[PDB]
Amino acid sequence: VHEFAKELDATNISIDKVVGAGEFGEVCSGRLKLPSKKEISVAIKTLKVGYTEKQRRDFLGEASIMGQFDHPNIIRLEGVVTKSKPVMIVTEYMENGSLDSFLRKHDAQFTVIQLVGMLRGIASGMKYLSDMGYVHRDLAARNILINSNLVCKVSDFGLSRVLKIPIRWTSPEAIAYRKFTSASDVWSYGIVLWEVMSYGERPYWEMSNQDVIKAVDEGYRLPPPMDCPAALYQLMLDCWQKDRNNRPKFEQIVSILDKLIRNPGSLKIITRPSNLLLDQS
């Protein structure tokens, strides 16, 4: 892990609050004193006492992946503690937590331009992740963290692979025969876009997995969120093209969103027999 992760001195770490339980142990928040003496807020994940070797590998493996990225919209690894126990992963603090739970607390309370800012950040982080040859495979609003300034950042590299399955977020070809590519991440990004504009509604609500799979394959798509700009719903449909070669690249998604930010009046253009809509394209 030390190729891509700084080994931290535990004297530089103060654990100030338990935030909850994670897959591998507890998650806390606290403070890290940097070599320069600057003190920053951090999230601190610990590996549970009595961990197996596999648990340690998987835990630290995520840190190894995260440590390869240095981008404002990918969660920042500050370092790890491995030479003492419990083993720890220390990341930048994100005060507003997971994006889906954050938005659920604030239904219809943000402006379209605020929401587009969030979406642009996620796209930019994904552009870099795909530039680096990684396919995330679990891109979902629950895996985006959001800070005090509403900056959104990609996290959770547990399913990430260099070039189990969350069916609702996964492209039809990835479900059909494990065809995971950056274009399947673009599909997932379309779902995240829907989640954000829906303030954290669950994609496909509580539909059976079998029906989500069948409906999507038949060409049905999530319907436009309430008061969703036409440009953003079209972007969803573009991310959801059946032919993965027809989906935009992340670079194009960033550009599209930047144009909407540059020309916010475009967002004023707003977008029947079934809940899902059959996209004829």
Side-chain angles (χ1 to χ4, degrees):
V1 69
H2 295 124
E3 179 164 32
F4 304 105
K6 302 157 180 175
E7 182 72 20
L8 301 169
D9 187 338
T11 72
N12 287 137
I13 300 168
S14 72
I15 301 181
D16 298 333
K17 190 187 188 306
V18 167
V19 302
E23 179 178 354
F24 299 99
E26 290 190 332
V27 178
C28 287
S29 68
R31 307 281 290 182
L32 174 63
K33 197 162 185 71
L34 300 171
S36 69
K37 311 308 192 183
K38 184 171 170 189
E39 290 164 22
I40 56 165
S41 294
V42 292
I44 300 153
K45 277 154 64 170
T46 59
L47 183 56
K48 65 192 189 177
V49 181
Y51 61 86
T52 65
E53 178 48 46
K54 176 161 169 60
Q55 285 172 332
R56 181 162 191 280
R57 282 198 322 274
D58 292 345
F59 184 70
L60 290 180
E62 288 195 39
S64 194
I65 292 179
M66 190 189 303
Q68 297 216 261
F69 305 116
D70 177 12
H71 189 275
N73 297 289
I74 299 179
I75 194 78
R76 181 170 172 85
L77 180 66
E78 293 294 337
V80 298
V81 177
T82 64
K83 301 185 192 300
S84 68
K85 302 185 198 187
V87 171
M88 294 189 269
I89 292 172
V90 181
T91 57
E92 66 183 307
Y93 182 60
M94 303 291 284
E95 182 181 297
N96 287 313
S98 292
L99 184 54
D100 66 322
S101 63
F102 178 70
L103 292 175
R104 284 175 202 126
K105 291 172 67 169
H106 303 292
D107 190 44
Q109 292 177 17
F110 297 117
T111 66
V112 172
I113 195 45
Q114 281 176 308
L115 297 176
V116 170
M118 298 172 191
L119 290 163
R120 196 275 187 199
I122 300 161
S124 184
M126 289 306 303
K127 197 276 195 184
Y128 188 60
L129 181 149
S130 51
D131 272 7
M132 292 289 285
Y134 280 85
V135 181
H136 189 286
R137 304 200 305 168
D138 194 24
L139 173 60
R142 63 173 178 283
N143 289 330
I144 301 303
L145 295 168
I146 180 166
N147 76 8
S148 64
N149 301 137
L150 309 180
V151 177
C152 292
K153 306 192 182 204
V154 182
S155 77
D156 198 345
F157 301 95
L159 281 176
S160 298
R161 304 287 184 263
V162 178
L163 285 166
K164 293 181 181 179
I165 190 184
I167 290 297
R168 287 165 150 68
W169 287 268
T170 302
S171 71
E173 71 279 359
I175 297 164
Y177 69 115
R178 316 196 72 259
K179 186 52 61 180
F180 287 98
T181 64
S182 291
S184 58
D185 277 351
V186 167
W187 180 283
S188 301
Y189 180 87
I191 303 294
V192 172
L193 174 53
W194 188 91
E195 288 184 281
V196 171
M197 300 310 300
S198 301
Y199 286 87
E201 185 56 85
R202 178 172 181 78
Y204 311 90
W205 313 282
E206 296 295 328
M207 289 180 64
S208 310
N209 280 341
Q210 292 178 359
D211 286 314
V212 175
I213 294 168
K214 194 169 294 299
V216 172
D217 176 72
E218 286 181 6
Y220 286 90
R221 300 292 182 261
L222 290 166
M226 192 176 151
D227 300 322
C228 186
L232 294 170
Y233 191 59
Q234 185 66 56
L235 180 53
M236 291 173 212
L237 299 183
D238 292 344
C239 292
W240 302 330
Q241 287 294 295
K242 183 175 278 286
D243 178 351
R244 67 176 164 285
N245 299 143
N246 290 331
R247 299 176 195 151
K249 308 305 190 187
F250 280 112
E251 183 174 6
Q252 292 174 305
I253 296 177
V254 177
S255 180
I256 288 157
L257 295 168
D258 280 343
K259 282 195 187 158
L260 295 173
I261 290 170
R262 174 168 176 271
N263 179 38
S266 63
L267 297 164
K268 299 179 167 62
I269 300 183
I270 310 310
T271 317
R272 195 176 291 283
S274 46
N275 299 331
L276 301 181
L277 298 186
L278 186 59
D279 183 4
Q280 300 288 351
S281 68

